[PDB]
């Protein structure tokens, strides 16, 4: 029972415990921290831990009517980043008692709430998160997960194929449904709403839902395969989102889509619980992710948001195509794809896995490769993501010269040839062009697609490596 | 420009040319190498809504050779010649079907 | 009624309208844009406008069964930032028709959805937003506001 | 900060701003004003503006605890009407701040509330209304609109055809449904309830709904075309209207009808929101319109009510046939049909468009030509309204000598021949009788219809020109 | 069993029964009819009856599968109006079987639906309506009525006093409530919302309700008299109207206001049933009445709308002050005030009572005199309307030089002096100025009010006599 | 008096005599003059509930002559002789179908 000392004091005195070993129930956070010149790194990390768990700028007498050491966040390690004058990885451990059970929102509010704007800090990035098994158990996780989804849509042995209807905004509901039908009847498993398509004057959401459902029924009747369309239920309010989800259920739709960042984690968890309660698959679009996760020195790395989306709930999630029009490094993407899909992922700094993460049988999330890809990227994607993934060709299907259906067929043939050659024992990363070439010799739609997009390739500097 | 024809499909490996028994042999070899348990299922129809086909005998749990699976497949072909016949691969680590291709159409 | 040209083409052809004056019902966005070296700034801004409103990487034939010019986002101005080798403020105008009434979520998903991760872009900041009165009217706003509070 | 002057003062001092230019967010009203002899016209218009926005007869001290100039309605123009000793068009501008968002009822209560009974006024007519885009955005508009309706009923390239079952009141529910079936199987797209048919002792509404739904199913099965029947859900209370609408939805009916004036705008907006929420088309009957809009010197012109119905919600609306048994001039009807159907309508005094009206992608409303028309009026109507319209032949179908179905077929053949000749490049207004004559040479039902109604024609003085 | 004659025929053959005597269960309508030159008057009246009950322009074969004579409306009398070349009063009788029980909307849709726009008609006015007792019994009537209202507010022996808060639009919710408090604490029984005040950006309805309720409680605590404020629940939709009514009930408000014409009769009947079910008084504002009822030659006379409002439901209704800023003749106003308040009103053409109306114990509606009145009109109003009325001084209270409360007191003193002198046996119509003068000698607030408004007087030509 | 027969209809321009290829040519010419994009759709049935037929190739966006549309129509006829074939006109200003008539019944 100590006395009360009014006045400010250094954070490092009570928030930097370099000898402390993490309990297995702790939440572990890795921070890429760049302090101001002349600010001690350990003091900066102690400020991060204090303002993220319990610390205030000055001493408060109400700290004494408590056991502070059982709630305080502690920075148990600081190690300089290679090739950095003022950039360090700080490992901060938070007691399990600090966080509301089953709330991703509360976890993020505690972790990334206000420490990123600390004046003594120049830049802060949340690289990784160790979610303890005891905390994982309090979440629903994905409404279904990879294996239950594959069982429900009766699709095995290959990546799924999807497409976004283009243009993003402008199409009427009926023409939208016609494009959906033409894409689906060509061989695509899924079609999807653009993340901007919610309910607009040119296209009311109810008309879109009706016409899309009709196109799905027609293409399912034709091909004899389960067809789906991710219906964007993202809305202004939770009531509107729930109405859109309920109508999608009424139209016997198997899957709905949500933007978990612009929509928010509260609404995302609401929708995930609803999806589990009504047998609806949940595709998750990561719109606005690059606002947070693009820079190396500041923000939140997408693996943290991916763990949080896995816990909050989602059957699919966009992960970046590596080889497409949007930025994502190969190694980090492999890391967070394993984080999203696997049950146990061991520590690996080379892939951005700063902590060993155990999911305690929380089902995995399907990886979605979308953005600026065509048939030529098909082998590499099959090499990168494997079967438990969705490959999305928006412009790579509708942009085919012959139309939506021939482009869908060209993508399906490229995918099936890649899967066949992979199963037979071929080196896809080596003979991908060879497989595509023989398939083109057999497939005219594929031949036209490949001759159209042969010299299309997005390569730039990797800002996030 | 060419209009896509209306053909009924049968899930994985259906948008490829007619499957030679050699390519089928390689597919079953692949599922044996991965540790998948092969099984032969059959059904009178191939409706997508149907979750379950009818199992032919039991899954080849003790199988180690592709010829044994081919023997089950041809036995199903002989017994049911007007049935869709497919070969499935059960992955038991994750408990999910990992391979599924049709080997026979009603003849 | 134009024909259908399958294949990729520059964004600047149909998404950079430097002569266009903003309608009073448009949503105006100011972007601090840092493109990759060797990427034209105007092409970078056109990519921002296209991927934020309607553009895809290649041409889609469904663009023709529409009036594209009434929905396309247009970059109507690019001005270099002082003391910056590769940083420009781009002013992009979006038709009021693109956005769901009363939905901040939809506005942000359209604006800041995926353009911030464009490979040809090095850094992007959304500095300011002009919300037209017609769009403002579709929101409730504060439940009470300062004076009622 | 002025002092408080208790006592009456002229309205023109603070409500007549002839120099003021209208803001683009203002609501603009054109008033045909006839003041009492010896009442200054500008004072009369100032009284209109004051009593329609904020003015009271005497000065109130609570005006000072406000910014009056930001709410006051201003008469910014008065111009004498040609050939009128005491009739002037006054243009009054109202701030957008005065009106409740999304409420047609509040707009009308502010505008046409009590100024029409001003003692200093002899006659007042509200001719036109400029609804600013900012105000338009606060309304739902039509639940579907023209293009979504055409997509939903899968009907393109021609005006739709309908009929009111006659007699208006008296038929039993079963005989009503039989007449509906005979009309629909003959080629009519739609049948409809008379605006008086709500629920009567000779015909309960639930029995009518059941039998009509059965007739619709039978005729749809026979012809293979989408058949519909406007089910009048107009009721005594909103609960009863909602029950009737819900039952129409339960019977899988595509469209319901409402009287937006006798039923009211509150119930109309309720039903329009319900219709949007449940995918139901909304036919709007303008019963009691002529009580308000018949005289040139007093009332509200139907174009104002048409704009208000477009905002409150309706997929169809009656507009008058021009050439039928009910009064409506050609030019004014063309004007408000363009107002109801188009997105942008420029100022045109010659057609009664006193203001340029922009709808900001608010969907258009289908025009309904009903009342005293037969096949002989068919070319002119196709000339007047075009495709995006409904042509309703109540007595022109059931009054055919052979029966409901042959009369429906005669109307369908006349309509299709007119559309074909229009598409081919014929002058319908010139060779309408020629087209009808050749079709009669081919169609016996049409021949009997034309020989029955050859000398039937409603022409009188146009009171509203 | 007659045969079927396809073709048009005169309406007078089957719809003009000059020998028919009205059944006591019939609905009787008096129409001021001005036909086109050369149109027979009896044919015009037959067209009115036919198109208002069952008639179509041509003969329909479905008339035969019915008993037409039991549903057809019949014109049983036509008498020329004095001093009119082409204006006749036609008496049309409608069977009770034609109308939906308890629906004012259906009654008006049948009567005033489309006959007012008949091309053969130049002008039509619905002057009066005989509602049979059997039809009256199907309506709820006023939720409470005059006597139940007086019992509930514990106010006897005098007219009630009210005021509209001015300016109409512009005041904030808090200042609005302050004005309400100052008016109520001065002696006014009621305050009220302007008919335009529903929910605006400068004043949300919930804040207005809260502040008004607080002002009511404060003034009730101060004066020790039941204070009230008519809360405008008129809204865009029935759900919004019901939410506003429910909140008014939650705040323990005794009375709500509705615009039965701009809001509509469906919503009005809904609100009246709700008011009866929740013990809430219903003040009825007649906004937009003058659009319909201003002209002598065309429209619907306000007595018809008053009967319809009595049946649909309302405890108060505006009737016009006679001597104020809005138009209404003395005799016709006396007529429809007796129609609204009395149980039995005998036929009297001199007061516009074309039919003897029996209400079968349907409670009467309070008469509301509002618009351009001050203390000088107080005796005449007490002479005209008597006790069972509400006298509303919007500008006559807030426009008092000393403030809201002294003006309220001045009006209360003038009213109480007039009532006292009337009870004592004085001639109010003769010595009204005398009573006001002695009261001013005793009341300073009254003295200031009278000296302010001594020369304020609205007199013009009576367009509706 | 004559009883109306029971015939299945096919929307616009179905209650007119059998459409001569000349009148079809005029209809396609009309939709070309209005700026409508012509397209050829086909389906095995003509159920009213069916929102979508199957698109033959792509809409003739670059079309300027009726003979080209007639060539697509006859190509669809040759490929699908047991299919209902119709010609649609897309108005892109309002984005709504503006012409729709059947040109072929199952042979
Ligand atoms: O529009 C697309 C792809 O369409 P297209 O095939 O035309 O590129 C997606 O919404 C995002 O671009 C995916 O990327 P991300 O992973 O950032 O969400
Ligand atoms: O009864 C009819 C027409 O039937 P019919 O074919 O027998 O004339 C309609 O309800 C109105 O008359 C239409 O006119 P309006 O535009 O005034 O509503
Ligand atoms: O605003 C008022 C009166 O306020 P004031 O005291 O300032 O005149 C009322 O709403 C109507 O004018 C009453 O008339 P009506 O009977 O036509 O509704
Ligand atoms: Mg997208
Ligand atoms: Mg009618
Ligand atoms: Mg008022």
């Amino acid at each position: 029972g100590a006395g009360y000392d009014a006045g400010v004091q250094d954070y490092r005195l009570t928030y930097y415990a370099p000898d402390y070993t993490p309990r297995d129930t702790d939440i572990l956070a890795a921070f890429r921290m760049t302090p101001q010149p002349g600010v001690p790194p350990e003091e900066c990390a102690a400020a991060v831990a204090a303002e993220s768990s319990t610390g205030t700028w000055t001493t408060v007498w109400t700290d004494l009517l408590t056991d502070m050491d059982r709630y305080r966040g502690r920075c148990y390690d600081i190690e300089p980043v290679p090739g950095e004058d003022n950039q360090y990885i700080a490992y901060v451990a938070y007691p399990l008692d600090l966080f509301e059970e089953g709330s991703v929102t509360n976890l993020l509010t505690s972790l990334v709430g206000n420490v990123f704007g600390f004046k003594a800090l120049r830049a802060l990035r949340l690289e990784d998160l160790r979610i303890p098994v005891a905390y994982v158990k309090t979440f629903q996780g994905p409404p279904h997960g990879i294996q239950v989804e594959r069982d429900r849509i009766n699709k095995y042995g290959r990546p799924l194929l999807g497409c976004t209807i283009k243009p993003k905004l402008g199409l009427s509901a009926k023409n939208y449904g016609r494009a959906v039908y033409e894409c689906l009847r060509g061989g695509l498993d899924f079609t999807k709403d653009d993340e901007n398509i919610n309910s607009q004057p040119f296209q009311r959401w109810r008309d879109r839902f009706l016409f899309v459902a009709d196109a799905i029924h027609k293409s399912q009747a034709e091909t004899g395969e389960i067809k789906g369309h991710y219906l964007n239920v993202t809305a202004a309010t939770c009531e509107e989102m729930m109405k859109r989800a309920a109508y999608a259920k009424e139209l016997e739709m198997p899957i709905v889509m949500h933007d978990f960042l612009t929509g928010g984690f509260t609404a995302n968890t609401t929708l995930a619980h609803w999806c589990r309660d009504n047998g609806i698959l949940l595709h998750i679009h990561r719109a606005m992710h690059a606002v947070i996760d693009r820079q190396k020195n500041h923000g939140i790395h997408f693996r943290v948001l991916a763990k949080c989306l896995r816990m909050s709930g989602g059957d699919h999630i966009h992960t970046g195509t590596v080889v497409g029009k949007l930025e994502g490094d190969r190694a980090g993407t492999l890391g967070f794809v394993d984080l999203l899909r696997e049950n146990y992922i061991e520590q690996d700094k080379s892939r951005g896995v700063y902590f060993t993460q155990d999911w305690a049988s929380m089902p995995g999330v399907m990886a979605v490769a979308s953005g600026g890809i065509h048939v030529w990227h098909m082998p590499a994607l099959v090499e990168i993501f494997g079967d438990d993934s969705v490959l999305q060709f928006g412009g790579g299907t509708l942009g085919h010269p012959w139309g939506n259906a021939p482009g869908a067929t060209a993508n399906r043939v490229a995918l099936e040839a890649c899967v066949q050659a992979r199963n037979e024992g071929r080196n896809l990363a080596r003979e991908g062009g060879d497989i595509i070439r023989e398939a083109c010799k057999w497939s005219p739609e594929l031949a036209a697609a490949c001759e159209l997009w042969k010299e299309i390739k997005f390569e730039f500097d990797t800002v996030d490596t | 420009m060419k209009t896509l024809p209306k053909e009924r499909r049968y899930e994985t490996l259906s948008y490829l040319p007619p499957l030679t028994d050699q390519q089928i042999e390689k597919q079953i070899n692949y599922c044996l190498q991965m540790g998948y348990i092969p099984a032969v299922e059959f059904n009178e129809t191939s409706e997508p809504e149907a979750y379950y086909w009818t199992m032919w005998k039991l899954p080849l749990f003790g199988a180690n050779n592709t010829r044994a699976v081919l023997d089950e497949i041809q036995a199903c072909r002989s017994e049911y010649g007007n049935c869709f016949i497919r070969v499935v691969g059960f992955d038991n680590v994750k408990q999910c079907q990992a391979v599924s291709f049709i080997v026979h159409k009603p003849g």
Side-chain angles (χ1 to χ4, degrees), chain A, chain B:
Chain A
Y4 168 41
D5 168 73
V8 317
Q9 87 194 36
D10 254 3
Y11 286 122
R12 211 177 62 131
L13 283 190
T14 60
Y15 288 98
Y16 183 49
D19 304 78
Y20 156 101
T21 201
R23 253 92 54 66
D24 91 324
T25 48
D26 286 323
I27 281 88
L28 314 183
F31 279 106
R32 172 168 327 261
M33 188 174 64
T34 279
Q36 305 257 7
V39 165
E42 304 78 33
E43 179 66 349
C44 197
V48 162
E51 292 299 317
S52 54
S53 53
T54 83
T56 149
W57 63 275
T58 183
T59 294
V60 296
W61 71 269
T62 53
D63 258 353
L64 299 181
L65 299 174
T66 53
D67 177 40
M68 280 301 114
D69 81 46
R70 95 145 56 81
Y71 305 113
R72 279 193 281 242
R74 348 215 203 289
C75 176
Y76 64 99
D77 197 320
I78 299 163
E79 42 99 11
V81 184
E84 310 287 336
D85 40 307
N86 230 50
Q87 170 167 127
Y88 311 80
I89 302 306
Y91 293 80
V92 182
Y94 307 80
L96 178 69
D97 219 343
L98 291 194
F99 306 99
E100 168 152 33
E101 306 90 332
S103 187
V104 161
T105 295
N106 175 248
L107 177 63
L108 274 35
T109 320
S110 312
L111 289 175
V112 306
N114 43 41
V115 290
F116 285 77
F118 215 65
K119 255 165 177 154
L121 244 179
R122 284 209 29 260
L124 190 55
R125 216 209 183 177
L126 181 51
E127 286 282 345
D128 200 17
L129 230 57
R130 204 287 299 276
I131 313 299
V133 164
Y135 200 50
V136 173
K137 290 305 293 189
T138 68
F139 290 84
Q140 170 193 107
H144 311 274
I146 288 153
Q147 333 303 149
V148 175
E149 171 202 2
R150 286 198 170 271
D151 295 332
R152 280 173 172 269
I153 67 193
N154 190 59
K155 280 164 193 308
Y156 305 105
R158 68 179 173 78
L160 317 169
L161 292 191
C163 117
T164 313
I165 291 305
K166 309 296 176 170
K168 310 160 59 62
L169 315 150
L171 274 168
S172 88
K174 168 82 91 94
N175 283 333
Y176 195 96
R178 176 189 279 100
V180 167
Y181 160 67
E182 290 296 335
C183 288
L184 283 180
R185 83 164 187 101
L188 301 193
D189 308 294
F190 285 110
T191 310
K192 65 179 295 291
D193 291 324
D194 196 74
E195 78 284 12
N196 298 172
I197 289 279
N198 298 154
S199 192
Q200 270 101 340
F202 55 83
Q203 206 194 56
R204 286 314 156 184
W205 72 265
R206 229 196 163 268
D207 314 321
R208 167 170 93 258
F209 278 34
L210 165 57
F211 286 117
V212 155
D214 193 39
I216 284 193
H217 304 311
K218 185 174 174 68
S219 63
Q220 264 212 31
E222 300 213 338
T223 76
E225 292 170 307
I226 290 308
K227 301 288 149 137
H229 182 284
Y230 315 155
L231 290 180
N232 202 178
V233 301
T234 315
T237 59
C238 322
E239 316 81 285
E240 195 50 55
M241 183 185 64
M242 271 308 111
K243 281 166 55 283
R244 280 160 212 217
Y247 188 45
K249 169 85 188 233
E250 188 225 86
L251 297 175
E252 278 153 321
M253 302 276 75
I255 185 161
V256 297
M257 144 171 50
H258 184 240
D259 302 279
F260 74 115
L261 300 166
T262 67
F265 264 114
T266 296
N268 189 261
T269 308
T270 290
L271 183 64
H273 290 2
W274 175 92
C275 269
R276 153 85 51 97
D277 278 3
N278 301 270
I280 306 283
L281 307 182
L282 186 48
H283 180 95
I284 298 298
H285 198 274
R286 59 182 198 163
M288 206 185 95
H289 81 89
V291 179
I292 300 126
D293 72 10
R294 181 81 189 275
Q295 302 311 119
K296 266 200 59 130
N297 65 312
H298 188 89
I300 301 161
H301 198 286
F302 179 72
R303 82 182 57 88
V304 172
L305 312 174
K307 296 199 162 143
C308 288
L309 191 273
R310 182 161 180 183
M311 299 192 300
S312 172
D315 290 311
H316 299 180
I317 192 186
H318 285 243
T319 61
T321 87
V322 170
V323 316
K325 83 164 177 261
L326 298 112
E327 187 142 12
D329 77 320
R330 161 92 69 134
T333 301
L334 256 47
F336 64 67
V337 162
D338 271 3
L339 285 180
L340 277 153
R341 304 204 291 213
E342 298 303 307
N343 187 39
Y344 204 78
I345 312 96
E346 335 207 319
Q347 212 223 42
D348 198 22
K349 141 174 278 311
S350 89
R351 294 201 303 149
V353 201
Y354 297 72
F355 312 103
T356 304
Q357 177 68 56
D358 182 5
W359 283 110
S361 322
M362 195 161 253
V365 184
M366 213 88 173
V368 180
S370 185
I373 54 178
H374 37 90
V375 292
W376 285 111
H377 305 297
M378 176 81 74
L381 302 162
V382 177
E383 184 41 5
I384 289 181
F385 291 92
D387 314 54
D388 278 357
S389 83
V390 190
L391 310 180
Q392 278 184 12
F393 304 100
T397 292
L398 290 103
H400 188 271
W402 298 2
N404 284 8
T409 287
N411 292 124
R412 186 52 184 278
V413 161
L415 184 273
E416 277 202 352
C418 287
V419 170
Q420 195 202 22
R422 190 262 321 259
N423 284 183
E424 277 158 320
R426 269 218 251 183
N427 193 342
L428 250 53
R430 214 168 29 74
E431 295 133 3
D434 168 41
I435 298 145
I436 282 175
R437 274 174 277 257
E438 28 189 277
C440 287
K441 271 42 177 280
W442 172 79
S443 175
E445 300 73 355
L446 193 39
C450 292
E451 72 157 2
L452 179 58
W453 290 303
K454 192 169 90 238
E455 272 51 58
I456 315 304
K457 177 222 172 33
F458 313 91
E459 266 314 294
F460 289 89
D461 200 31
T462 299
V463 192
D464 259 8
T465 339
Chain B
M1 170 126 60
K2 205 204 138 196
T3 289
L4 189 81
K6 308 212 192 163
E7 190 29 41
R8 187 146 263 244
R9 326 302 319 205
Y10 303 95
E11 285 87 75
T12 318
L13 309 198
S14 211
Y15 288 71
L16 294 186
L19 230 51
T20 83
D21 208 39
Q22 296 74 2
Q23 281 176 348
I24 279 153
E25 191 98 281
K26 267 119 82 153
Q27 297 303 288
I28 331 171
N29 185 264
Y30 168 79
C31 53
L32 296 168
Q33 308 319 80
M34 310 263 92
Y36 307 139
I37 304 155
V40 177
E41 322 271 350
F42 59 98
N43 213 240
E44 297 77 21
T45 88
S46 279
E47 283 127 1
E49 298 76 17
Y51 283 144
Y52 302 116
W53 284 21
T54 306
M55 215 189 312
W56 165 264
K57 282 167 72 229
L58 273 182
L60 286 322
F61 296 110
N64 87 97
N65 203 313
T66 74
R67 190 66 232 174
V69 192
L70 200 44
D71 299 337
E72 262 218 0
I73 289 144
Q74 58 84 28
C76 210
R77 193 177 236 100
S78 144
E79 166 128 39
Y80 312 101
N82 270 36
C83 264
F84 300 88
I85 316 187
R86 97 209 157 178
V87 177
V88 301
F90 291 112
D91 177 6
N92 69 283
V93 183
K94 287 162 325 154
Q95 183 153 52
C96 189
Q97 198 156 298
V99 168
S100 295
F101 54 92
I102 266 63
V103 280
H104 191 251
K105 306 312 198 308

